[PDB]
Amino acid sequence: SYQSINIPVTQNMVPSSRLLVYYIVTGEQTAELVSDSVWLNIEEKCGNQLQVHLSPD
Amino acid sequence: CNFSDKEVEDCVTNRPCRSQVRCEGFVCAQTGRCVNRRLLCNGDNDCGD
């Protein structure tokens, strides 16, 4: 069995990213490209984390 | 002459050997012939058996 995709969802991925996994298997003699993909919904978040407030609340 | 111009002695397995040639195909169980899976259910004895 294979290493999982253990990766940080870095900020560049927001709001959405798509994972495609692929290999070529040579078969007996003829290669085949095998692939699958999934849409990964990411939390909407800002890179600046900017916040604004009235200081005399 | 005696026909035995050949003679043979048995041994221990002193060492391994890599004879185990990998068959990606189907292995014809009794013969060990490697046949391509497209020849399964072919209607033809492409194996020996």
Cβ distance B11 to B28 under 8 Å? no
Find out whether A28 and B24 touch, Cβ atoms under 8 Å. Answer: yes
> What is the resolution in angstroms?
3.3
CA distance B33 to B49: 10
Per this entry, what is the length of chain B? 49
Technique used by the depositors: cryo-EM
Distance in angstroms (rounded) separating the CA atoms of residues A6 and A21: 13
Q: Does B36 touch chain A (CB under 8 A)?
A: yes
B36 annotated ligand binder: no
Find the farthest-apart pair of alpha carbons in chain A and give their distance in angstroms, rounded: 75
Q: How many CB atoms lie within 10 A of CB B47?
A: 18
Q: Does A28 touch chain B (CB under 8 A)?
A: yes
Nearest to A44 by CA among A17, A8, A20: A17
Contact with chain A for residue B25, Cβ under 8 A: yes
Can you give the three-state secondary structure of chain A, one letter per residue? CCCCCCCCCCHHHCCEEEEEEEEEECCCCCCEEEEEEEEEECCCCCCCCCCCCCCCC
Using the structure block, give the residue that is written with the tokens 């040579």: A26
Q: Using CA atoms, how far apart are residues A46 and B12, in angstroms rounded to an integer?
A: 72
Is-cis flag, bond preceding A15, omega within 30? Answer: yes
